[PDB]
Design a protein around this ligand. Structure first.
Ligand SMILES: Cc1cc2nc3c(=O)[nH]c(=O)nc-3n(C[C@H](O)[C@H](O)[C@H](O)COP(=O)(O)O)c2cc1C
Ligand code: SF4
Ligand code: SF4
Ligand code: SF4
Ligand code: FES
Ligand code: FES
Ligand SMILES: [K+]
Lengths: 87, 214, 263, 432, 45
């Protein structure tokens, strides 16, 4: 329920092949740029890194919870069909 | 008991025979019309009590059936059935032997009365008689604390009891006889044990110190 | 116009009348700890962790179900607030079973993080903990009911978002068993969402069943294709396999729920 | 000019002229005792006059809260938005030691139903919801047949006492709980839901039963209302202390010679009450160990303070307790205070609402620790922790019963801490 | 007629049947008023 991990822009690279090692079942890969994420304060600063390092980037947008309206009085209404059946 | 996960059983199965008498149905409709429409589910508690009167305990079929008469989801009836006190989710004896051991009620040695019932019936706290007439189960403050340790026999109040006073009361119920619900002493309802210290002279009649026409 | 001026930790915020206290401090980043208040769900105040110190007030207030009005400074970090946070959380952890080594929610465990942030570092409990029998309500949701603490989250979700009025509470006191009473089978198109709204590791994904643990898995974002709504999902993968499918947040698309078909 | 002492309330001034059940509790006897007199003008004068004498009387809360009835009922004086206004009467009698309501439901029912009618007229309410405790069966039927008699007399309902106002009366029997005594649980229990109290403010005056403007009131609080308006608030303000005016039934129980209840002036020296009506604590006054002044929730008080302390809301407050419901419970010297408190707080555990975290986890935890103290297996350090968790319970609960169970623990600690300590050393000695 | 403070004439509660509560509740149902309407039949509607 906490929202501390959704306050910093992060840049990550695409996933590549993950084959199992013959000797013992492993997750061996051959893409060095696999476990490399980078935190960024704001989006324009994050993307400024991408062109500067010449990486074909894809940008999403900062999804934020829309502001809701909560009222404990609604749980017991006279006519409105929002009367909670049990607390 | 202290159980709250009902398990379907040969007697307490969802198909357990339960209904409401034609006399009963006109009582539920009286309960329903007493309460405003749009909130008729408020009548769940009186109806659930009424089912208890009809068939004693409350089988799961009885709780399910009253749920359909109240157009209420069956579990919502389940919650209120297993949250209150006199709703008997399991079969009980013909006379529910209730006793209070709260501090204002136990200060006058309620244990002696409770022990006296236990030895006379040969029934420990919680279980019922082998003949299924009496069930001695302890309850909290029932409301008559100003009197001596009292017992709630099924549905009537007996007060001012004594380790001897329950004895002849119990065997009265055993041998098909009801006693008089009330204090077992000279005190009628709540009067002082030594006599009367209030309401001595006749009360003032209608009309005393009315200011102007009111 | 209509905006009511209230203060949080001294700083003044501009809030729409009827705003709850919890929302007001959220506008500045202060996230009051919670266990019962879910934004998509109703408000119940059963959590008793959102207790916060009102300025020049004698009584700690429940930040969730309280409409804030003007001339109030929400003393989030006050000593009175922290003591209330400490008090109720110790009550929460009193009867939690020593399971989270094996409890699957270990790693998310909304109890663990809040204990690591708002809670003591030792237990003064000297009695025996209560144990609660498990109830089966699905081959897809596990129920170690002895762990969960007075949900009102499972209950509201069933009665508001899924409509299935089968989950409930049974009894009072310390036990007050939460479940279905009779042996019923909680199936709905959105039944699986009780798993990710469970702060405690009682309602857990039965197909998951300790396949992996949170820190080791990598989360990638995608869109489900099982339905045509197109719910945004998070495909948690590790070592080259998919263990869990989690619902992302997209509001208008899927809120934060996904169908059991997609999960 | 002012009453230096208090007590010996005039018998004519005793509001409940049938509290002992020694007079006809039917309609005919009630009106023969002053009931149902000039209700016409009482209903005709409107809420403004009815509430005016309530302000003049300054009736304090008789249900265990002590809140002034005046402004509490004044919250209803407000134009209707469409939601019908209701009035409910709390008759749970949940508190151990409470018996005052139980007797006066059956002994003078018509006075109570007339009390609702006068209260409802000021309240602008539509229907009366007297929520009687389910165990209270015979008295509930006694009150209901009284309502039928009043209905046949055309006193309530259609054209109440020929005044145009229409006020219905319903007797709803509960299904057994302390918690239903709480005002929001009573609303929840009436609504057919689980008897779990709802949160704080949305207010009952705004959102009450079925989401309608309502206000709970103790049975005695509305019982005195007719006698209030007929004789004015000047009746009630004459007796009692400064903002502790009026009279009240006093549930004297426990280790006393004559356990009984009695209507008497309030703010009376506590020694006078237990010595006059109860004939002193058994074994004499010196045999008294502690007194629970009103209700279990209010902390107990040792005899060192019981010498004088007047029985009124303020006087109990500096006595580190409260008047509550004037349920006088008296322990003697032979009484084990630790055992009595454990029995008291074990009752709270059984009658715990279960909703909120503190009162559910803490009170059950209070049971475990306090049970260990009674046996004595505990260690001396745990005494203060019980105090700490008691403060954690206090003020952190939706229901006031949590604070109603923390106070007895605090009262026991503050007044008899050596008693547990020596009892604690006794266990550590014989067990070795 | 004479004032006698020695009788508990409240004794009709002794011969009270279990059904009595609802039994006489049925009979005054005539002496009631039409209950207010919430509009919708039930909160589930
Ligand atoms: C746990 C609990 C139980 C209560 N039980 C009762 C009761 O049995 N009778 C009562 O009159 N008030 C009781 N009250 C007090 C109510 O909150 C409320 O003050 C009362 O119903 C009406 O008080 P008033 O007449 O002063 O308005 C209880 C409160 C709590 C918290
Ligand atoms: S919920 Fe599970 S992971 Fe969290 S503390 Fe309890 S047992 Fe441990
Ligand atoms: S599983 Fe989660 S939501 Fe359900 S009762 Fe347990 S803690 Fe509460
Ligand atoms: S404090 Fe206890 S009695 Fe009060 S609402 Fe919470 S659980 Fe119920
Ligand atoms: S004290 Fe015995 S009934 Fe409350
Ligand atoms: S967040 Fe749980 S009580 Fe407000
Ligand atoms: K979970």
């Amino acid at each position: 329920s906490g929202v501390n991990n959704t306050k910093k822009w992060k840049m990550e690279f695409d996933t590549r092949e993950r084959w199992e090692n013959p000797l013992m079942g492993w997750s061996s890969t051959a893409d060095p740029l696999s476990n490399l994420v980078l935190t960024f304060s704001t989006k324009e600063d994050a993307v400024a890194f991408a062109e500067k390092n010449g990486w074909s980037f894809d940008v999403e947008e900062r999804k934020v919870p829309k502001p809701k309206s909560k009222s404990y009085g609604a749980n017991f209404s006279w006519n409105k069909r929002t009367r909670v059946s049990t607390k | 008991g202290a159980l709250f996960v009902h398990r379907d059983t040969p007697e307490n199965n969802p198909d357990t025979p339960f209904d409401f008498t034609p006399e009963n149905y006109k009582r539920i409709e009286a309960i329903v019309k007493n309460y405003p429409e749009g909130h008729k589910a408020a009548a769940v508690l009186p109806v659930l009590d009424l089912a208890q009167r009809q068939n004693g305990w409350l089988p799961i079929s009885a709780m399910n059936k009253v749920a359909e008469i109240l157009q209420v989801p069956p579990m919502r009836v389940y919650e209120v059935a297993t949250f209150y006190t006199m709703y008997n989710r399991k079969p009980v004896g013909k006379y529910h032997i209730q006793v209070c051991t709260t501090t204002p009620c136990m200060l006058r040695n309620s244990d002696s009365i409770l022990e006296a019932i236990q030895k006379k019936l040969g029934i420990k706290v919680g279980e019922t008689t082998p003949d299924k007439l009496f069930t001695l189960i302890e309850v909290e403050c029932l409301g008559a604390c100003v009197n001596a340790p009292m017992v709630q026999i099924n549905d009537n109040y007996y007060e001012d009891l004594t380790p001897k006073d329950i004895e002849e009361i119990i065997d009265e119920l055993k041998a098909g006889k009801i006693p008089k619900p009330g204090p077992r002493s000279g005190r009628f309802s709540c009067e002082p044990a030594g006599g009367l210290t209030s309401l001595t002279e006749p009360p003032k009649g209608p009309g005393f110190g009315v200011q102007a026409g009111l | 116009s209509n905006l009511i001026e209230v203060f949080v930790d001294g700083q003044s915020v501009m809030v729409e009348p009827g705003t709850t206290v919890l929302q007001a401090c959220e506008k500045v980043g202060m996230q009051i700890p919670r266990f019962c208040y879910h934004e998509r769900l109703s408000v119940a105040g059963n959590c008793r962790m959102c207790l916060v110190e009102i300025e020049k007030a004698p009584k700690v207030v429940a930040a969730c179900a309280m409409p804030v009005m003007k001339g109030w400074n929400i003393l989030t970090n006050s000593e009175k607030s922290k003591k209330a946070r400490e008090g109720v959380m110790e009550f929460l952890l009193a009867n939690h079973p020593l399971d989270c080594p094996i409890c699957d929610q270990g790693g998310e465990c909304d109890l663990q993080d809040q204990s690591m942030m708002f809670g003591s570092d030792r237990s003064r409990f000297l009695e025996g903990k209560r144990a609660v029998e498990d109830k089966n309500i699905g081959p897809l949701v596990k129920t170690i009911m002895t762990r969960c603490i007075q949900c009102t989250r499972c209950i509201r979700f069933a009665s508001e978002i899924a409509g299935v009025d089968d989950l409930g509470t049974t009894g009072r006191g310390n036990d007050m068993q939460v479940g279905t009473y009779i042996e019923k089978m909680f199936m709905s198109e959105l039944s699986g969402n009780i798993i990710d709204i469970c702060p405690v590791g009682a309602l857990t994904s039965k197909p998951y069943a300790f396949t992996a643990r949170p820190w080791e898995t990598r989360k990638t974002e995608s869109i489900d294709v099982m339905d045509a709504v197109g719910s945004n999902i998070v495909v948690s993968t590790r070592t080259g396999e998919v263990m869990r499918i989690l619902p992302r947040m997209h509001e208008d698309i899927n809120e934060e729920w996904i169908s059991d078909k997609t999960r | 000019p002012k009453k230096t002492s208090f007590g010996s309330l005039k018998d004519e001034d005793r509001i409940f002229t049938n509290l002992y059940g020694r007079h006809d509790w039917r309609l005919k006897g009630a009106q023969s005792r002053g009931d149902w007199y000039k209700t016409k003008e009482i209903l005709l004068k409107g809420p403004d006059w009815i509430l005016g004498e309530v302000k003049t009387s300054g009736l304090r809360g008789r249900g265990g809260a002590g809140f002034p009835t005046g402004l509490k009922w004044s919250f209803m004086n407000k134009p209707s938005d469409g939601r019908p206004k209701y009035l409910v009467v709390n008759a749970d009698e949940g508190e151990p030691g409470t018996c005052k309501d139980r007797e006066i439901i059956r002994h003078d029912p018509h006075k109570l139903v007339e009390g609702c009618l006068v209260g409802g007229r000021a309240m602008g309410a539509r229907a009366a919801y007297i929520y009687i405790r389910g165990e209270f069966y015979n008295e509930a039927s006694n009150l209901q047949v009284a309502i039928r008699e009043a209905y046949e007399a055309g006193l309530i309902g259609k054209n109440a006492c020929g005044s145009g106002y229409d006020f219905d009366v319903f007797v709803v029997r509960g299904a057994g709980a302390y918690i239903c005594g709480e005002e929001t649980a009573l609303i929840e229990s009436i609504e057919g839901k689980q008897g779990k109290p709802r949160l704080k403010p949305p207010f009952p005056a705004d959102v009450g039963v079925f989401g309608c403007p309502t206000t709970v009131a103790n049975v005695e609080t509305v019982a005195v209302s007719p006698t209030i308006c007929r004789r004015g608030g000047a009746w009630f303000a004459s007796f009692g202390r400064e903002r502790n005016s009026g009279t009240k039934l006093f549930n004297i129980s426990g280790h006393v010679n004559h356990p009984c209840t009695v209507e008497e002036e309030m703010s009376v020296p506590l020694k006078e009450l237990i010595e006059k009506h109860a004939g002193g604590v058994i074994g004499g006054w010196d045999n008294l160990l502690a007194v629970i002044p009103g209700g279990s929730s209010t902390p107990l008080i040792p005899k060192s303070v019981c010498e004088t302390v007047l029985m009124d809301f303020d006087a109990l407050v500096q006595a580190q307790t409260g008047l509550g419901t004037a349920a006088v419970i008296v322990m003697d010297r032979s009484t084990d205070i630790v055992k009595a408190i454990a029995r008291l707080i074990e009752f709270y555990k059984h009658e715990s609402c279960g909703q909120c975290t503190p009162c559910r986890e803490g009170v059950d935890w209070m049971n475990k620790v306090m049970a260990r103290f009674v046996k004595g297996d505990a260690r001396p350090a745990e005494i203060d922790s019980l105090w700490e968790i008691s403060k954690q319970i206090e003020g952190h609960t939706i229901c006031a019963l949590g604070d109603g169970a923390a106070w007895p623990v605090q009262g026991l600690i503050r007044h008899f801490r050596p008693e547990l300590e020596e009892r604690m050393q006794q266990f550590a000695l014989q067990h070795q | 007629e004479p004032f006698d403070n020695s009788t508990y004439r409240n004794l009709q509660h002794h011969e009270y049947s279990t059904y009595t509560f609802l039994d006489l509740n049925v009979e005054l149902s005539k002496f009631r008023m039409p209950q207010p309407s919430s509009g919708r039949q039930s909160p589930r509607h």
